[PDB]
TrEMBL record:
GO molecular function, one term: metal ion binding
Main location: membrane
Provenance organism: Streptococcus pneumoniae serotype 4 (strain ATCC BAA-334 / TIGR4)
Pfam families: Lipoprotein_9 (PF03180)
Name of the protein this chain belongs to: Lipoprotein
Residues that coordinate or bind Zn(2+) 2: D29
InterPro entries reported in the protein's UniProt record: Lipoprotein_NlpA
GO terms for cellular component: membrane
Amino acid sequence: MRGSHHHHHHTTIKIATVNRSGSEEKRWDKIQELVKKDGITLEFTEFTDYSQPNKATADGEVDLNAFQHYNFLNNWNKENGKDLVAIADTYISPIRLYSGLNGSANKYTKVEDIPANGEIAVPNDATNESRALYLLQSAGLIKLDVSGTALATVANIKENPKNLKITELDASQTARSLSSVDAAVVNNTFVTEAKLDYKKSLFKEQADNSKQWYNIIVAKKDWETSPKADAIKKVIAAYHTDDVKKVIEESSDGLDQPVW
Ligand code: MET
Ligand SMILES: [Cl-]
Ligand SMILES: [Zn+2]
Ligand SMILES: [Zn+2]
Ligand SMILES: [Zn+2]
Ligand SMILES: [Zn+2]
Ligand SMILES: [Zn+2]
Ligand SMILES: [Zn+2]
Ligand SMILES: [Zn+2]
Ligand SMILES: [Zn+2]
Ligand SMILES: [Zn+2]
Ligand SMILES: [Zn+2]
Ligand SMILES: [Zn+2]
């Protein structure tokens, strides 16, 4: 059933995220510590997948969300006829291709070793699906019949030398699929929960137009007339500190790269 989540409660500012494992949420404890003197309590709704946080925000269940990149936001707004806005950039985490697993060993240590007739899992939402497909193309596994800013779908695969089966799954399910596929494209959000080591990935998305993959803090367009606007501006100030910069780098082991 849709919208699985839990809450993590410390003026009160409610933030929707997607749950991450290990130390990756420590940025939020540091931000809370910074805005404490200002009288601000943060409360988090932590969803399990990318379909829910923007809806929570447009519906007024939360004040902010922090989970997506600009492309995901733009696409979600267009699809849903909404106009949530980015009010700060956070980090970039270039998406990676990971080997399928045999127990806890990687089956492959190079792209070239993916077998003919193999299966690769990719996210199934338009922007991360596209992102994964361009990744598979830059890794030399496929060619696409779209380019530039065109969203690629699986129907846009033009060449497929190894006859790979490309299976699109929920973004939150690609890392879990690694026990039974040859390779998967996995968003940073899901890496730690599956116990993956991002530094042992087969392939990393190439920098270039990289800003479209920048993560953001998002609110409703009229947030600035809200009684919570002052508190929101302080939270943003706390995120954009040297202290938080360091916590993100340390608590994610470098997986998330701050962009401010
Ligand atoms: C919901 S869009 C995906 C965001 C994810 N943190 C990424 O940068 O890959
Ligand atoms: Cl805390
Ligand atoms: Zn709830
Ligand atoms: Zn709550
Ligand atoms: Zn929790
Ligand atoms: Zn959590
Ligand atoms: Zn915490
Ligand atoms: Zn906390
Ligand atoms: Zn409610
Ligand atoms: Zn409600
Ligand atoms: Zn899809
Ligand atoms: Zn598709
Ligand atoms: Zn490592």
